[PDB]
A paper describes a structure:
Three different crystal forms of the apo C. albicans [name], to resolutions of 1.99, 2.3, and 2.4 Å, were obtained. While the C. albicans apo [name] structure is very similar to previously determined [name] structures, an unexpected finding that emerged from analysis of the crystal packing was that despite being obtained under very different crystallization conditions with distinct crystal lattices, all three C. albicans apo [name] structures displayed the same intermolecular interactions between subunits. What is notable about this interaction is that the 80s loop of one subunit docks into the active site of the adjacent subunit and vice versa, suggesting that the loop may act as a substrate. Indeed, Pro104, which is located at the tip of the loop, is inserted most deeply into the pocket and is surrounded by residues that have been implicated, via mutagenesis, to be involved in [name] [name] activity. Three residues, in particular, were implicated as important for [name] catalysis and correspond to Val59, Asp41, and Tyr97 in the C. albicans protein. These residues all make direct contacts with Pro104, which rests within an aromatic cleft formed by Tyr30, Phe50, and Trp63. Although most of the contacts that hold the loop in position in the active site are with the central Pro104, additional hydrophobic contacts with Ile102, Pro103, and Ile105 are provided, while Arg100 makes hydrogen bonds with the carbonyl oxygens at the edge of the pocket. Notably, the interface in the C. albicans [name]-[name] interaction is minimal (burying 592 Å2 from solvent), which suggests that, like known substrate-enzyme complexes, the proteins form a weak interaction; typical dimer interfaces bury >2,000 Å2 of surface from solvent. Comparison of the C. albicans [name] apo structure with [name]-FK506 structures reveals that the 80s loop binds in the same pocket as FK506. Interestingly, unlike the C. albicans apo [name] structures, which were all captured with Pro104 in the cis conformation, in the A. fumigatus structure, Pro90 in one subunit was bound in the cis conformation and Pro90 in the other was bound in the trans state, thus potentially providing a snapshot of self-catalysis.
Author numbering: 3 to 124
Amino acid sequence: EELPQIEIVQEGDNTTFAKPGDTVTIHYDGKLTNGKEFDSSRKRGKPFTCTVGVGQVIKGWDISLTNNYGKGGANLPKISKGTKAILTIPPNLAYGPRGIPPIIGPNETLVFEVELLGVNGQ
């Protein structure tokens, strides 16, 4: 299957990993491949909290934060608490062929800078 690109820029505690159903808290920056930013929790003023692995965020996010639903994968490093990463997510794992104009265009790849701040409120 097709997976997102995950590059660790800062290692976490290598102990606290999130799994489907868990609640996570992260800070993130979202930009198009042309460098143009489309979303950012840091600029909004608060970290984002959500349930991962159940499709309540884009599929690329669920995969990165739960290590492919616990299945893992080829070249798919784990993200623990305190980990900074860069997520590259293809259209099929983002907003697909139609996209969400005028917020995001069709057939669009997305690049995220994410920092895992907490798992299950801790």
